[PDB]
Amino acid sequence: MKIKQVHVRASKIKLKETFTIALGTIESADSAIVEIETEEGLVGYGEGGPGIFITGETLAGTLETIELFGQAIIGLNPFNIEKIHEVMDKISAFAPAAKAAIDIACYDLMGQKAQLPLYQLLGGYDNQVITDITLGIDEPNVMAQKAVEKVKLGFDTLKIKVGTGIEADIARVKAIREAVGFDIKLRLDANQAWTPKDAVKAIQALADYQIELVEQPVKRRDLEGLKYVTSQVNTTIMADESCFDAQDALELVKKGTVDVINIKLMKCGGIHEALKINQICETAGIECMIGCMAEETTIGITAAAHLAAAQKNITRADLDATFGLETAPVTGGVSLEAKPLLELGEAAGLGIS
Ligand SMILES: CC(C)C[C@H](N)C(=O)N[C@@H](Cc1ccc(O)cc1)C(=O)O
Numbered sequence: 001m002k003i004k005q006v007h008v009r010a011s012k013i014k015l016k017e018t019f020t021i022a023l024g025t026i027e028s029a030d031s032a033i034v035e036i037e038t039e040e041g042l043v044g045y046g047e048g049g050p051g052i053f054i055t056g057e058t059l060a061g062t063l064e065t066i067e068l069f070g071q072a073i074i075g076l077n078p079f080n081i082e083k084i085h086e087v088m089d090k091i092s093a094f095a096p097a098a099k100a101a102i103d104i105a106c107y108d109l110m111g112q113k114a115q116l117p118l119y120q121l122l123g124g125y126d127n128q129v130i131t132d133i134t135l136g137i138d139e140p141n142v143m144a145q146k147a148v149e150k151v152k153l154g155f156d157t158l159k160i161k162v163g164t165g166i167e168a169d170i171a172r173v174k175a176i177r178e179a180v181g182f183d184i185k186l187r188l189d190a191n192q193a194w195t196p197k198d199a200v201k202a203i204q205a206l207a208d209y210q211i212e213l214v215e216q217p218v219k220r221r222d223l224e225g226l227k228y229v230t231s232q233v234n235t236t237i238m239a240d241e242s243c244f245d246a247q248d249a250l251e252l253v254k255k256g257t258v259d260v261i262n263i264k265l266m267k268c269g270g271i272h273e274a275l276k277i278n279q280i281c282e283t284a285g286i287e288c289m290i291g292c293m294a295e296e297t298t299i300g301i302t303a304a305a306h307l308a309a310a311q312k313n314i315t316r317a318d319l320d321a322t323f324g325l326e327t328a329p330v331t332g333g334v335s336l337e338a339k340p341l342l343e344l345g346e347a348a349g350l351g352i353s
């Protein structure tokens with residue numbers, strides 16, 4: 001098959017509520033939605049959802065880059081994902097959201113051409129994924145109350161955002177555990193807010209609160225400090241901002257920096273690159289959690305879920321971006337409904353539109 005044309009459009013969707021993390025706030029999911037059409041008529045959908053305080057990418061920059069990529073892959077076979085990434089990598093030294101947008105659309109096309117759900121093409125380990133739901137930074141009693149709400153919706157794993165100071169961060173977790181009890185799994189995410197010593201201190205202070213894992217406790221570049229935390233606590237430590245791509249992953253495995261790694265299609269440039277990170281991690285005995293940017297919609301989330309369902313080593317999931325969307329840009333895929341279970345159907349590719 002051959003790519004005939006590539007179209008992209010801006011999508012700006014308000015979130016039901018501003019989300020606060022240690023890095024800042026997000027109130028609108030602004031993404032680039034791409035449609036790749038083949039000469040035979042098949043259409044693939046992709047998306048680039050950039051998180052400025054994570055990668056620095058912007059919607060305007062992502063749109064321009066996708067157009068450059070699009071005009072360079074005309075005539076290529078979607079299955080030649082190897083050449084498609086080579087072409088994009090030669091065009092741009094860094095544009096994970098734009099690359100993911102193209103990459104996702106190609107995988108959607110592969111699935112449609114093969115007449116198979118994407119999760120079958122990517123590994124076939126399962127046809128669904130169970131996701132947690134993240135609670136944004138707020139006052140202890142508020143977060144605790146929202147925690148009760150989410151658990152009533154059926155969520156058994158909650159991702160707690162922290163990072164305004166260990167004193168308050170500790171109070172947030174205690175209140176949450178106290179409110180929902182110990183039957184719920186609680187994972188913390190500090191989005192780089194703590195120093196290596198404060199991190200150890202906070203984690204130890206929460207020893208009796210049954211913490212599943214702590215995500216990116218220190219600054220992204222502080223790998224010595226991240227490792228310090230990891231080698232100082234029995235609590236599982238996960239890297240997020242410290243790991244963008246396969247190259248970063250190889251570096252972390254080499255140094256024994258963390259216990260688990262957070263994979264985001266918008267950080268690595270798509271499914272093709274994400275698979276590399278998981279293979280490297282799996283070989284090193286490092287499990288992976290599939291994550292997401294708040295700026296992504298059904299397209300990005302559905303793609304991530306198919307990859308997570310497909311791969312055995314991607315044992316955790318944090319795909320809750322759609323739960324906060326006011327509207328859905330396309331039909332099909334993971335819905336806007338706030339629910340832990342994301343069941344992927346039998347529809348070919350992403351099962352979108
Ligand atoms: C609201 C949900 C989708 C947040 C998601 N689970 C998450 O925590 N993502 C990042 C943090 C983040 C990225 C981008 C934006 O705009 C806000 C927050 C993470 O730290 O895992």
Ligand SMILES: [Mg+2]
Binds near residue numbers: 215216262
């Ligand atoms: Mg994180």
